[PDB]
Design a protein around this nucleic acid. Sequence first.
RNA 1: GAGCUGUACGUAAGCGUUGAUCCAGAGAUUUCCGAAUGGGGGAACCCACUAUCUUUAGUCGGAUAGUAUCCUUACGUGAAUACAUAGCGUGAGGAAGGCAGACCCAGGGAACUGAAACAUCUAAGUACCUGGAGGAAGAGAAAGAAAAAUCGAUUUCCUGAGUAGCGGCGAGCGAAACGGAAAGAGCCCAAACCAAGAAGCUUGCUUCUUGGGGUUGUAGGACACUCUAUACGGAGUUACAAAAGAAAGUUAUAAAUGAAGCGGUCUGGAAAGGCCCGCCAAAGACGGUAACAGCCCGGUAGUUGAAAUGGCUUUCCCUCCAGAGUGGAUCCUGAGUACGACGGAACACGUGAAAUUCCGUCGGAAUCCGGGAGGACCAUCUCCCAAGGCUAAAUACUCCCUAGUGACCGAUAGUGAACCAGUACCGUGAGGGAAAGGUGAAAAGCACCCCGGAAGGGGAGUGAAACAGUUCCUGAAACCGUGUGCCUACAAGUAGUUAGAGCCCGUUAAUGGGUGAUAGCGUGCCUUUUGUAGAAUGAACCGGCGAGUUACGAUUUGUUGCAAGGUUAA
RNA 2: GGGUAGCGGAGAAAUUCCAAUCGAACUUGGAGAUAGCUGGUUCUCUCCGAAAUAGCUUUAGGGCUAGCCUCGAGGUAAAGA
RNA 3: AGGUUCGUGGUAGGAGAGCGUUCUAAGGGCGGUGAAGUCAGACCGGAAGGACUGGUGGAGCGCUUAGAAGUGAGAAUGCCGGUAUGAGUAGCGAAAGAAGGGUGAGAAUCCCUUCCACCGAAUAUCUAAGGUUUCCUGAGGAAGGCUCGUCCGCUCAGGGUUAGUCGGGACCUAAGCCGAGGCCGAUAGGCGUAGGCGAUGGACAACAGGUAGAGAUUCCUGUACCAGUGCUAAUUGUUUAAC
RNA 4: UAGGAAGAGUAGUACUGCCCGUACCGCAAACCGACACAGGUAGAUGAGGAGAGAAUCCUAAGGUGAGCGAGAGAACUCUCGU
RNA 5: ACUCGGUGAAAUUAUAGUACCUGUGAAGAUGCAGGUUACCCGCGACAGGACGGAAAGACCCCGUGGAGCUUUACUGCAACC
Length: 102
Amino acid sequence: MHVKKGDKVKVITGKDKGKSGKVLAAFPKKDRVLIEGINMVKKHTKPSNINPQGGILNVEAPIHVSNVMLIDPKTGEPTRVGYEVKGDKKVRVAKKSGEVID
RNA sequence: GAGCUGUACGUAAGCGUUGAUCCAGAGAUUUCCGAAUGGGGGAACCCACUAUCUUUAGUCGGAUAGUAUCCUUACGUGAAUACAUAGCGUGAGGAAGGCAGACCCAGGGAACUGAAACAUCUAAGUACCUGGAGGAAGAGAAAGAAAAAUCGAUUUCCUGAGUAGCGGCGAGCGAAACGGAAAGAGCCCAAACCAAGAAGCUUGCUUCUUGGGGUUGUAGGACACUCUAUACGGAGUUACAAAAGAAAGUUAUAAAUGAAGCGGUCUGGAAAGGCCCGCCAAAGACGGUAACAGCCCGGUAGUUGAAAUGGCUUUCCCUCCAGAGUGGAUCCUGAGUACGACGGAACACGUGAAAUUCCGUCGGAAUCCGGGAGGACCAUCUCCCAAGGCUAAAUACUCCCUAGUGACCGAUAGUGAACCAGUACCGUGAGGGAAAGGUGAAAAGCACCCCGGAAGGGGAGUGAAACAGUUCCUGAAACCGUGUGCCUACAAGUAGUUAGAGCCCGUUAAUGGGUGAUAGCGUGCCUUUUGUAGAAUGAACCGGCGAGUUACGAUUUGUUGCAAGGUUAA
RNA sequence: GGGUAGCGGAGAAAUUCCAAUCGAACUUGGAGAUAGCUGGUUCUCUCCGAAAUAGCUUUAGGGCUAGCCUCGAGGUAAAGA
RNA sequence: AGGUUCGUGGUAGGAGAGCGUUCUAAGGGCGGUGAAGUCAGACCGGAAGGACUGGUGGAGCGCUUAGAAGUGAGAAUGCCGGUAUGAGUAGCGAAAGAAGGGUGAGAAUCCCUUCCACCGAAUAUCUAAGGUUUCCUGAGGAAGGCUCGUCCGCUCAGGGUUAGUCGGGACCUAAGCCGAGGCCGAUAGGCGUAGGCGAUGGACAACAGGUAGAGAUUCCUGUACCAGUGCUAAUUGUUUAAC
RNA sequence: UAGGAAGAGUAGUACUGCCCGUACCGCAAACCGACACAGGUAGAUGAGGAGAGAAUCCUAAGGUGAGCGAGAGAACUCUCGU
RNA sequence: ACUCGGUGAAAUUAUAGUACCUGUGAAGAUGCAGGUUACCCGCGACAGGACGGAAAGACCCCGUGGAGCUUUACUGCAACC
Ligand SMILES: [Mg+2]
Ligand SMILES: [Mg+2]
Ligand SMILES: [Mg+2]
Ligand SMILES: [Mg+2]
Ligand SMILES: [Mg+2]
Ligand SMILES: [Mg+2]
Ligand SMILES: [Mg+2]
Ligand SMILES: [Mg+2]
Ligand SMILES: [Mg+2]
Ligand SMILES: [Mg+2]
Ligand SMILES: [Mg+2]
Ligand SMILES: [Mg+2]
Ligand SMILES: [Mg+2]
Ligand SMILES: [Mg+2]
Ligand SMILES: [Mg+2]
Ligand SMILES: [Mg+2]
Ligand SMILES: [Mg+2]
Ligand SMILES: [Mg+2]
Ligand SMILES: [Mg+2]
Ligand SMILES: [Mg+2]
Ligand SMILES: [Mg+2]
Ligand SMILES: [Mg+2]
Ligand SMILES: [Mg+2]
Ligand SMILES: [Mg+2]
Ligand SMILES: [Mg+2]
Ligand SMILES: [Mg+2]
Ligand SMILES: [Mg+2]
Ligand SMILES: [Mg+2]
Ligand SMILES: [Mg+2]
Ligand SMILES: [Mg+2]
Ligand SMILES: [Mg+2]
Ligand SMILES: [Mg+2]
Ligand SMILES: [Mg+2]
Ligand SMILES: [Mg+2]
Ligand SMILES: [Mg+2]
Ligand SMILES: [Mg+2]
Ligand SMILES: [Mg+2]
Ligand SMILES: [Mg+2]
Ligand SMILES: [Mg+2]
Ligand SMILES: [Mg+2]
Ligand SMILES: [Mg+2]
Ligand SMILES: [Mg+2]
Ligand SMILES: [Mg+2]
Ligand SMILES: [Mg+2]
Ligand SMILES: [Mg+2]
Ligand SMILES: [Mg+2]
Ligand SMILES: [Mg+2]
Ligand SMILES: [Mg+2]
Ligand SMILES: [Mg+2]
Ligand SMILES: [Mg+2]
Ligand SMILES: [Mg+2]
Ligand SMILES: [Mg+2]
Ligand SMILES: [Mg+2]
Ligand SMILES: [Mg+2]
Ligand SMILES: [Mg+2]
Ligand SMILES: [Mg+2]
Ligand SMILES: [Mg+2]
Ligand SMILES: [Mg+2]
Ligand SMILES: [Mg+2]
Ligand SMILES: [Mg+2]
Ligand SMILES: [Mg+2]
Ligand SMILES: [Mg+2]
Ligand SMILES: [Mg+2]
Ligand SMILES: [Mg+2]
Ligand SMILES: [Mg+2]
Ligand SMILES: [Mg+2]
Ligand SMILES: [Mg+2]
Ligand SMILES: [Mg+2]
Ligand SMILES: [Mg+2]
Ligand SMILES: [Mg+2]
Ligand SMILES: [Mg+2]
Ligand SMILES: [Mg+2]
Ligand SMILES: [Mg+2]
Ligand SMILES: [Mg+2]
Ligand SMILES: [Mg+2]
Ligand SMILES: [Mg+2]
Ligand SMILES: [Mg+2]
Ligand SMILES: [Mg+2]
Ligand SMILES: [Mg+2]
Ligand SMILES: [Mg+2]
Ligand SMILES: [Mg+2]
Ligand SMILES: [Mg+2]
Ligand SMILES: [Mg+2]
Ligand SMILES: [Mg+2]
Ligand SMILES: [Mg+2]
Ligand SMILES: [Mg+2]
Ligand SMILES: [Mg+2]
Ligand SMILES: [Mg+2]
Ligand SMILES: [Mg+2]
Ligand SMILES: [Mg+2]
């Protein structure tokens, strides 16, 4: 996908529009991403070996990758991304600031 | 280029930037059955022999290779029977089986039906069975079509034309040439003769093989002489002879890059929608994203990319090559053949005045001073040269792969099959053959409390919605219930309609709505009938599905264009 | 455990049996056989409106021509009642 | 456009004008401030039909002018699905049960005890065929069981079948079947010799006990037999030739 | 007997002996009959009294009480007795 | 069979508030006419009617329907001479 695990994310649409977060996991097969502090759900969980006490656990849920834009590490605004092969590696390039995100 | 160990959750254990999972090309491995092939067999099983090796103290056990049948061929052995043949053995090559329910060539070959009966005829050389194929097959370079003049190998399409004809002259069947197009390409033998060899001895001869020569109708060739030519030139694996090897280019099979809004605000669970502003465009295809996106994502136009393998096209290499003329002694030019009789079949043509082609059986020519055809046949003329073979393209079809399209279907439709479908199920078997799609944007799939053994509920919670709670979008009718306003236990009812009190309501507001004591009138619907309430037929009820269409011809009416003209087909 | 298969087989003979099927088995195909016969054929209104007869017919509950209906167009030395 | 006159029952049937459904094209629109569909109303048109308002629903659909049709159902002993009536009706598939304890949420129906009854050339015990896990143990009670069920040939999870001698093959053949060469025949194939398959028959070596969840001539304990092999110890034979 | 043949038997010891079936039902609720169906299904064994007997009646070993019940005791129908 | 507890079908069915007599009518009426009877809802019984249910009458006729059989019907074919 265009967004990797460990990246910084600005949420572009949805109920959490305007918020920012970090990628905790990526699901390219189904095209979803898990982002910290974003799209919290409440699960009614019975007591089990995992989660010994159970209850109403408040955790995170995936959102679609199209509702996401990368944050420039310096300019700090959502940018579309380009790809430039610099040296022996192809790196991602911010298309507003014209600089290398990686 | 960052996650991964499928559907498929989960647990467990692990692996990946020292670059995994994944995608494409090329390799290796590939149990048993099945043509099944060492022998057998009731499918996926059973039992071996011969060589070489291995284990054990030795039987017992293990590994590898070979071992079917027929055809062709080489060698060897070898009977009645003397030579020899048959037979037997070994080796080397080849075949066998399947299918794409299509297309085409051949062998065999119906009936129902139509003729308003039926036998000739039709259906129909169709269905079907069997055998051969090929990517196409078949046909194909005139013993042709023709007719005051010519054409010049096949095939397919348009016309000719529902014409000429055939026909219990009934029902019906039904051409071809000329003319216009698509596509186009021509060639090898046999025989006269030459050279060599071999067998018989046909005993100095014929007859067998090999090589050269040569293939045609104005007749051509052999044969005689002239001219040139042995690679100067020409041709080629699609016929014309056949097998290889290189290089360049292109294409197919993975991919890379790729412009422009997080614009403000309203509603909302969520904006891609409304209103107000911008921008890109060789890119406003398509799909996704919480509602309808050129500017969010995958992408799109444009421009690039191939280690490996395949295809195609050029060039090289390689390979193979006599062709003109003038003569007319002698020689050659496809024999049990062409034809004829008899019996059949194919020709549009049913025996007919029946040409032309093929099959079975009998008879049976000429050979250049020769032979065939021109729809009986003769004469004249004209055209042609059989009884040997090969040949691309234009034509037919689609099990497949790639890219797309539709005034095609939308879950009783469209394939039988949108779902683990030729499945479940039925049948001894061949065979027949279903039903069955939809939670939500996201499992956030209801912690906890209460009644109950559970199932199932009532709260609480999630969500925009739970009257979306794991047959879950919507949720009609039949059918089953609970509650209630008006009527009903002296009445004879196709159940309504017209008149009409009383009681109860209050509308799309108008000479309004529900129910109805009592009074008049009144024998369902359909089909089929001279005539049906009919004791004639059909329907338990509700829902879905369910019957004059299309192609090509004819005729008539309307409309439009042109008009003694109108109009093109392929 | 085996053999005989439908233009066939078996029959101490009854048209008897050949997988609950037999004056000619079952299955698939020709095949949507053919049916001058019975049943069915789906929205509305406006104008007109029959026949159940003659002739021939392997004809008689079928057909064909005429007679009777409907739509359109014509011509008069007006022909109809 | 307006008059005048004459008309306006209708089956088979002829002629005309229209309504509604799906799709296409152009124009012009509606719609999360709620589309289609569905429900209910006392509205409009000459008919087929068409609006308006409210509930449910939760994403698409009208209008105009043309065009094209899988074009409109009440009947076919029509096809498929759903649901009634008969009706709490017929039936519940040959037979002897009773009580006391137990288990359990729950007992005529499950377990135990006692008494009674039935079969007994069988309704007892083996074993071929056929079936194919139905067998044992632990859990279970939605559906199946013509009632009930705590039970089960039912559901779930784990188990369970031991052979030199038993039955079959590695042994034999009958009927019948296949069949190298061969004979016959439009094709396909039919018949048949050598050879080979094929038991329902012939030949062939093991008995008695024990085994408390499920196997027994198979496992175990005692005592055997059949066929072979090596190793020891004696005997004997060698090409007028042991065997 | 034709043939093959220098090894052979004897006694004792110890070792070797493959593949397939094997559960369970089997006059039956497990097989053939669409069913937990009054039908059908080869063979071996099959006790006592009385008896010719495998007839008949009552019993042994062994196996069963049959997958809807209780209570009333009308017509009528069925199977029985006088 | 009947009453009680458990379980629980089917053929059939245009909608039904479903009397009798004499008549009428497609000529034999629960439903039409004129009269005569008759409070509402069931349970156990019996079969006169609903031309009761079941099976598109096997008899009879018709169709230019079919099939099996016969012969000195017609036309053929095998086989044999
Ligand atoms: Mg392997
Ligand atoms: Mg085989
Ligand atoms: Mg074999
Ligand atoms: Mg085996
Ligand atoms: Mg060995
Ligand atoms: Mg030889
Ligand atoms: Mg000799
Ligand atoms: Mg082949
Ligand atoms: Mg082929
Ligand atoms: Mg014929
Ligand atoms: Mg013909
Ligand atoms: Mg013909
Ligand atoms: Mg074939
Ligand atoms: Mg090929
Ligand atoms: Mg071609
Ligand atoms: Mg060819
Ligand atoms: Mg030519
Ligand atoms: Mg020629
Ligand atoms: Mg020429
Ligand atoms: Mg063409
Ligand atoms: Mg030559
Ligand atoms: Mg010459
Ligand atoms: Mg914004
Ligand atoms: Mg909001
Ligand atoms: Mg917007
Ligand atoms: Mg585009
Ligand atoms: Mg789009
Ligand atoms: Mg944008
Ligand atoms: Mg000659
Ligand atoms: Mg002639
Ligand atoms: Mg002739
Ligand atoms: Mg001619
Ligand atoms: Mg000629
Ligand atoms: Mg050829
Ligand atoms: Mg639906
Ligand atoms: Mg869903
Ligand atoms: Mg969804
Ligand atoms: Mg409780
Ligand atoms: Mg609960
Ligand atoms: Mg709802
Ligand atoms: Mg809903
Ligand atoms: Mg409802
Ligand atoms: Mg309803
Ligand atoms: Mg009431
Ligand atoms: Mg009175
Ligand atoms: Mg009133
Ligand atoms: Mg009153
Ligand atoms: Mg009649
Ligand atoms: Mg109905
Ligand atoms: Mg027959
Ligand atoms: Mg008899
Ligand atoms: Mg009979
Ligand atoms: Mg009209
Ligand atoms: Mg409508
Ligand atoms: Mg529009
Ligand atoms: Mg509606
Ligand atoms: Mg409605
Ligand atoms: Mg309504
Ligand atoms: Mg709603
Ligand atoms: Mg049209
Ligand atoms: Mg249509
Ligand atoms: Mg339709
Ligand atoms: Mg109707
Ligand atoms: Mg029908
Ligand atoms: Mg029906
Ligand atoms: Mg249904
Ligand atoms: Mg039905
Ligand atoms: Mg019912
Ligand atoms: Mg008791
Ligand atoms: Mg089972
Ligand atoms: Mg049950
Ligand atoms: Mg019951
Ligand atoms: Mg219990
Ligand atoms: Mg069990
Ligand atoms: Mg044995
Ligand atoms: Mg053997
Ligand atoms: Mg023995
Ligand atoms: Mg020994
Ligand atoms: Mg073995
Ligand atoms: Mg074994
Ligand atoms: Mg037993
Ligand atoms: Mg006696
Ligand atoms: Mg007795
Ligand atoms: Mg006893
Ligand atoms: Mg009761
Ligand atoms: Mg009862
Ligand atoms: Mg009366
Ligand atoms: Mg009553
Ligand atoms: Mg007639
Ligand atoms: Mg008959």
